[PDB]
Amino acid sequence: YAALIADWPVVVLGMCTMFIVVCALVGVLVPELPDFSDPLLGFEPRGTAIGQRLVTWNNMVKNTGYKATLANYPFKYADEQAS
Amino acid sequence: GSEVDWNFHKDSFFCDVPSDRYSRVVFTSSGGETLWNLPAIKSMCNVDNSRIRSHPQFGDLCQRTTAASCCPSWTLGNYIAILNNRSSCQKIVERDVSHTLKLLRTCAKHYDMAARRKDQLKCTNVPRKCTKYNAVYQILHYLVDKDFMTPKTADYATPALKYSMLFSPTEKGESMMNIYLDNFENWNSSDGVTTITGIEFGIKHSLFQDYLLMDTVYPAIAIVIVLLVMCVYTKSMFITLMTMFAIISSLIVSYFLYRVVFHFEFFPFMNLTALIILVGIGANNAFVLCDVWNYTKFDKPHAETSETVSITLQHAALSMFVTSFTTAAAFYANYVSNITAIRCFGVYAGTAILVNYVLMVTWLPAVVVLHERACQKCHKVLFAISEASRIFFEKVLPCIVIKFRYLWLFWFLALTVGGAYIVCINPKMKLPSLELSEFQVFRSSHPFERYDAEYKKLFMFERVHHGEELHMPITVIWGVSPEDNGNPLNPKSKGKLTLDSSFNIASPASQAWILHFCQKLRNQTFFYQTDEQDFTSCFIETFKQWMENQDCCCSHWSFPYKQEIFELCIKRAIMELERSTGYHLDSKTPGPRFDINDTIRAVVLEFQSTYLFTLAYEKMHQFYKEVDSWISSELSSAPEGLSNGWFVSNLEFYDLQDSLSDGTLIAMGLSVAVAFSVMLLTTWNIIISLYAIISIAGTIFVTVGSLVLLGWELNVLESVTISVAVGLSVNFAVHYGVAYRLAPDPDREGKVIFSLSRVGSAMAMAALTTFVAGAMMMPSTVLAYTQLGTFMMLIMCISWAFATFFFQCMCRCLGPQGTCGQIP
Ligand SMILES: CC(C)CCC[C@@H](C)[C@H]1CC[C@H]2[C@@H]3CC=C4C[C@@H](OC(=O)CCC(=O)O)CC[C@]4(C)[C@H]3CC[C@]12C
Ligand SMILES: CC(C)CCC[C@@H](C)[C@H]1CC[C@H]2[C@@H]3CC=C4C[C@@H](OC(=O)CCC(=O)O)CC[C@]4(C)[C@H]3CC[C@]12C
Ligand SMILES: CC(C)CCC[C@@H](C)[C@H]1CC[C@H]2[C@@H]3CC=C4C[C@@H](OC(=O)CCC(=O)O)CC[C@]4(C)[C@H]3CC[C@]12C
Ligand SMILES: CC(C)CCC[C@@H](C)[C@H]1CC[C@H]2[C@@H]3CC=C4C[C@@H](OC(=O)CCC(=O)O)CC[C@]4(C)[C@H]3CC[C@]12C
Ligand SMILES: CC(C)CCC[C@@H](C)[C@H]1CC[C@H]2[C@@H]3CC=C4C[C@@H](OC(=O)CCC(=O)O)CC[C@]4(C)[C@H]3CC[C@]12C
Ligand SMILES: CC(C)CCC[C@@H](C)[C@H]1CC[C@H]2[C@@H]3CC=C4C[C@@H](OC(=O)CCC(=O)O)CC[C@]4(C)[C@H]3CC[C@]12C
Ligand SMILES: CC(C)CCC[C@@H](C)[C@H]1CC[C@H]2[C@@H]3CC=C4C[C@@H](OC(=O)CCC(=O)O)CC[C@]4(C)[C@H]3CC[C@]12C
Ligand SMILES: CC(C)CCC[C@@H](C)[C@H]1CC[C@H]2[C@@H]3CC=C4C[C@@H](OC(=O)CCC(=O)O)CC[C@]4(C)[C@H]3CC[C@]12C
Ligand SMILES: *[C@@H]1O[C@H](CO)[C@@H](O)[C@H](O)[C@H]1NC(C)=O
Ligand SMILES: *[C@@H]1O[C@H](CO)[C@@H](O)[C@H](O)[C@H]1NC(C)=O
Ligand SMILES: *[C@@H]1O[C@H](CO)[C@@H](O)[C@H](O)[C@H]1NC(C)=O
Ligand SMILES: *[C@@H]1O[C@H](CO)[C@@H](O)[C@H](O)[C@H]1NC(C)=O
């Protein structure tokens, strides 16, 4: 493309800025802007044979017992109808 | 307003006990190195009641009728005023000072009473009754640090206590930000007799964001400086402006490609720093193209512009792509770490550099060809600058590097071996040693980091707090299987889901096997006997012990029941096991788990252990390794043998440390492999490849050694820096190696001066521009900028010096026929 950037510089310098500006506009419109509130939102390993178990054991706690149909892991509750 | 009376109304009362939940300030006086004097105490209490008892505070205890005061202050001055019962802290007579001095002297040897709750009465026996209501104990355990009243110093000697503390009756929390955002941040300290050093309002992480916005003037200034320097190299302002706009647009389109095309949605913090890095990178490409342009335009000037453009592309694209792709692969190699932040920063920076290379290849020739279109002293100074630069980088530098030619070898070999020994054996880099709750995220002189690092070990109620001695528990689970579901790769930090398995506990063999497992585990060495936990252990044991009654339906059976008794009697039993003791159990109790249907789904046992909880690496590693090696002995029935291999304690810091220690090494390996491969493929001469590898190793070892000597941990940043350094090293070796080859001179001492004179200007300009673009981050507040700036300066000034001296003084041994690589 040596000849292309020889006799036609302005078209190659304008297509670039067209692409750049449409990219900037899409990137500022479509996706949700970042937060920047918690400086340590990422520092936690994932899937290392000892982080999987921690994640699962923490999910086991958040799904605790509810007075009825906890959709979770409760204690005895579901058989308290005798009273 | 906030105008009411205070608590001291000639009433010998007191609000509460000074706890850890409140807000703390730390005072040091001056070089005088003493606080026991009326000016110090009075000024301390005054700056207290001025800088914190002025702003309207609606968050308070409100235990009395005073709406703007519940406790007076909780300071040393109040505790002096309660002696001799002078109500106002302002009224001190300088004799109660001597009184409390003598009292603390005569009583400090007994430090030892917790509290005397009854008014003017002591509940338990105390050695002395001359002490007031918890005065000496509180004033020794909370307010004054350890050096005061030590038994090490002899009698008649007066201590110094260079540090004191001061509490506040309000409760620490995010609400303090306003208080801090107007009254504390601007002004230096109090007057020259008392100076605040440490603050613990508890807003160290929530306020962080703000400082970010307040410290973006240092990046901007940096950009400006770069522009200036580029004007000196290429005189046309047009090219400078267009290449800076190309860099910015590259970052923008890289963000766009990052967010929606690659489609993963999480933007970490460190990604911001990326910009700075690229500011010291992209410009380099220009300083390779433009220069070459002129050379071609100096060889065949009468030719058509198209031919010159084709020739300069032919002569520049190879090296541009080599260096850009090498740095990009060095960044992308972080995609093998298990953390999230670096696993995203890698991809982002890599895409940024690649797109920047593409734009430097396309956009830049366009603008350089479209650039076809009292001042005598202002032109003569530039002419003299050009002449001096030419005569330096053409005749002086080769002379300096080649005439000595032997001191450099020994000197740099000594530096390399010193760096190797200082990174490998004695002071090897250390893993992190601070709880995940408080990382050093500010400057190392901010009033928050002081209290969070230095002063949290001088005060008793924090040192004994460091003396926790909490054992480590082990747990076992048979209900669920370990599996992660929500976005593992390029994660979201919001992906989790629970699941189930298929096992039965009704099999009597499984019951007997669980009982045998418990009995066996009660035998090993990593066990700790308490003889106090009844239900907070194996449930089967206490269940069996509970089922010894009769005439109630089942009773008085063997151990392996027929499971129709078992499934119903578990529920029959726990509803009365809750009665005796442990009336409450909340989602972390060794009791078995149930479902919507009352069947059993998850069984969880728990035990204590003898290893104490710590933060070191070897201890926790030994614990985990040996205990998991033992637990791996299952050999059990078909059920509960699958989804069996379970073990989990409060060990997360160890996970972070292990993931760092593996990711850094894997990334280093991958990046150095790519670097050596690219150097070999671009040189086509094995001896030059060996010299380049030696230079890369030298610069890596020296920079990492200087980093560790200066004193650096591996939090999350250095885990990327250690890999970025070996990618940013070869940038100069590639250029010096390509230029050395294809030179019209066969001899050894010749053709070195050629390459050096031809590319020394470009290398020096790139080095200087990255140096000065990283040197405008040193004064700042957020830490990442300072870390990155220091690393940038220290890596560029080292890599340039090595790749010039230790390479040219080495590449002159090669023989003119050499190897020339394999035969393609
Ligand atoms: C308009 C926005 C969206 C983009 C701007 C970036 C480029 C497309 C601009 C920046 C500077 C412009 C140049 C500024 C000046 C000139 C000189 C102009 O010719 C003259 O002024 C000749 C005068 C004479 O010799 O008599 C021809 C267009 C050109 C090359 C312009 C071409 C378009 C350029 C490169
Ligand atoms: C040496 C260089 C040239 C190698 C190639 C570099 C990049 C082009 C590669 C490296 C790793 C790749 C990534 C590996 C894994 C993923 C996750 C993957 O995630 C999903 O598909 C989940 C979201 C969805 O369902 O769409 C999307 C593609 C992506 C970002 C890949 C995009 C292309 C990347 C950045
Ligand atoms: C490459 C870096 C070193 C400098 C160039 C980029 C910064 C100038 C930009 C990048 C992201 C920007 C931030 C993106 C979002 C926000 C949140 C925004 O929040 C509000 O307006 C208040 C409400 C809220 O978000 O809670 C304040 C500006 C701030 C911090 C921005 C400040 C300017 C920042 C740090
Ligand atoms: C891959 C290239 C480009 C970089 C250099 C890598 C290796 C030559 C070195 C660098 C750091 C070295 C490590 C530094 C420290 C240690 C700890 C050392 O064990 C100790 O406890 C040593 C200190 C002590 O006795 O307390 C065992 C070797 C090891 C893993 C070393 C293994 C070899 C390593 C990885
Ligand atoms: C050449 C580049 C890659 C830099 C050198 C690598 C360092 C940044 C890292 C990578 C691996 C790390 C090592 C990984 C494992 C260990 C073992 C670890 O052992 C213990 O916990 C203590 C043992 C004892 O005290 O006997 C001590 C830190 C150390 C040597 C680490 C020291 C710092 C190292 C060498
Ligand atoms: C291109 C060249 C000049 C690069 C540097 C070469 C050597 C100076 C390096 C390369 C490999 C290094 C070794 C890599 C790994 C180790 C193991 C490391 O750990 C132990 O041997 C443990 C000793 C202990 O128990 O204290 C000690 C340093 C050592 C020998 C290193 C010493 C320095 C070595 C020989
Ligand atoms: C010919 C030239 C270009 C060779 C390279 C020199 C500098 C670019 C570097 C190489 C080694 C660096 C030094 C490596 C180690 C230290 C010690 C370091 O010491 C401390 O911070 C604390 C020391 C301690 O108490 O142990 C201060 C920086 C300094 C002098 C560094 C300053 C910058 C130096 C001289
Ligand atoms: C590129 C040409 C012009 C040669 C430049 C030589 C010196 C002017 C440079 C070479 C290495 C530089 C040093 C590299 C690193 C450091 C550590 C740096 O440490 C800190 O400021 C600590 C920051 C922190 O960790 O909080 C202080 C400046 C210093 C000594 C630099 C001072 C300026 C030095 C000596
Ligand atoms: C303080 O108490 C003592 C004894 O209880 C009393 O004699 C003295 O008058 C009190 N102080 C004041 C200012 O009244
Ligand atoms: C700090 O500023 C105050 C004025 O707010 C001044 O009185 C004091 O002397 C200053 N201290 C130092 C060390 O500059
Ligand atoms: C466990 O208890 C003692 C102490 O180790 C030992 O002698 C005994 O044989 C062990 N019992 C079982 C069932 O392993
Ligand atoms: C038990 O769960 C099943 C699920 O299919 C449901 O149909 C049934 O109603 C549940 N029984 C009780 C008592 O909740």
Cα B472 to chain centroid, rounded:
25
Instruction: Choose from B596, B631, B644 for mutation: most chain A CBs within 10 A.
Output: B596
Residue A4 touches partner B, C-beta closer than 8 Å? no
* C-to-N gaps above 2.5 Å in chain A, after residues: none
Q: Compute the distance between CA of residue B43 and CA of residue B40 in angstroms, rounded to an integer.
A: 5
Do residues B796 and B774 touch, judged by C-beta distance below 8 A? yes
Query: CA distances (Å), B770 to each of B38, B235, B278, B458, in order?
Result: 55, 19, 9, 42
DSSP string across B654-677: HHHHHHHHHHHHHHHHHHHHHHHH
Q: Are B318 and B341 in contact (CB under 8 A)?
A: no
Q: How far is the CA of B523 from the centre of ligand 11 (A)?
A: 6
> Rounded CA gap, B708 and B701, in Å?
10
Q: Residue B570 has which token pair?
A: 């578990």
Give B775 Cα–ligand 5 centroid separation in angstroms.
Answer: 30
CA-nearest of B603, B618, B602, B613 to B649 is B613
Same domain? For A28 and A46 the reply is no
Residue A27 domain flag: yes
CA distance B441 to B254: 27
| Distant-in-sequence, close-in-space partners of B384: CB < 8 Å, separation ≥ 6 | none
Q: Does A19 map to a domain? A: yes
The dihedral of CA B699, B700, B705, B710: what is its sign? Answer: positive
Tell me which chain A residue has its CA closest to the CA of residue B306.
A6
Dihedrals phi, psi of B577, to nearest 5 degrees: -65, -30
Which residue matches tokens 């140096």? B771
Alpha-carbon span B313 to B293, nearest angstrom: 9
Instruction: Measure the CA–CA gap between B23 and B19, rounded to whole angstroms.
Output: 9
Question: What does the alpha-carbon distance between residue B221 and residue B776 come to, in Å, rounded to a whole number?
Answer: 8
User: Is A13:B367 a contact under the CB 8 Å cutoff?
Assistant: yes
**Interruptions in chain B after residues (C–N over 2.5 Å):** 111, 373, 552
Nearest to B513 by CA among B607, B627, B630, B635: B635
> Which of B163, B153, B3 minimizes the C-alpha distance to B67?
B3
What Cα–Cα distance (Å) separates residue B778 from each residue in B21, B369, B447, B608, B792? 35, 39, 18, 49, 11
Residues A46 and A25 in one domain: no
**A14, B687 Cβ separation under 8 angstroms:** no
Q: Does A77 touch chain B (CB under 8 A)?
A: yes
**Which residue of chain B has the CA closest to A50?**
B655
- Please, are residues B266 and B489 in contact by the beta-carbon 8 Å criterion? no
- Cβ-based contacts of A12 with chain B (< 8 Å): 362-363, 366
Please give the distance, rounded to the nearest whole angstrom, from the Cα atom of residue B502 to the centre of ligand 12: 18
Q: Residue B529's CB: how many other CB atoms inside 10 A?
A: 8
**Selection from B419, B327, B283 nearest residue B794 by Cα:** B419
Q: How far is CA A63 from the centre of its chain?
A: 22
On whether both A22 and A49 belong to a single domain, the answer is no
A82 domain-assigned:
no
Q: Give the pair of three-digit tokens for residue A83.
A: 């009273």
How far is Cα B83 from Cα B79, in angstroms, rounded to an integer? 7
**A23, part of any domain:** yes
Phi and psi (nearest 5°) for B199? -135, 140
Structure solved via: cryo-EM
- Listed in sequence order, the residues at least 6 apart from B211 whose beta carbon sits closer than 8 Å to its beta carbon are B442, B781, B782
Are A26 and A6 in the same domain? Answer: yes
Q: Which of A6, A31, A77 lies nearest to residue B305, judging by beta carbons?
A: A6
In angstroms, rounded to a whole number, what is the distance separating the alpha carbons of residues B779 and B114?
47
C-alpha B64/C-alpha B16 separation (Å) is: 12
- Answer yes or no: is A83 within a domain: no
**Torsion angle in degrees (nearest 10) through CA of B430, B436, B442, B445:** -60
Give the number of domains in chain A.
Answer: 2
The answer to whether residue A10 is domain-embedded is yes
User: Domain map of chain B by residue range?
Assistant: 22-203, 213-373+394-428+655-808, 474-650
- Cα–chain-centroid distance for residue B114? 38
Residue A48's domain spans which residues? 41-77
Helix-helix angle B305-332:B718-740, to 10 degrees: 150
CB B334 within 8 A of CB B342: yes
Q: Is A56 an 8 Å CB contact of chain B?
A: yes
Whole-angstrom distance, CA of residue B193 vs CA of residue A25:
57
Q: Which two tokens stand for residue B16?
A: 């509460």
Among B67, B73, B99, B68, residue whose Cα is nearest residue B88: B73
Spell out a b/e string for B72-87, using b for 16 or more CB atoms within 10 Å of the CB, else e: bbbbbbbbbbbeeebb
